[PDB]
Amino acid sequence: NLYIQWLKDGGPSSGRPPPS
């Protein structure tokens, strides 16, 4: 879920690092 919520925002193109 966490990574899905990061990807839906645009992943790297959203000014935010990926969740570990």
Q: Map residue 5 onto helix, strand or coil.
A: helix
Q: Report CA 7 to chain centroid distance, whole Å.
A: 4
Report the sign of the C-alpha dihedral through residues 9, 13, 15, 20, in that order. positive
**Residue 12 CB contacts under 8 Å (≥ 6 apart), including other chains:** 18
**Residue 9 CB contacts under 8 Å (≥ 6 apart), including other chains:** 16
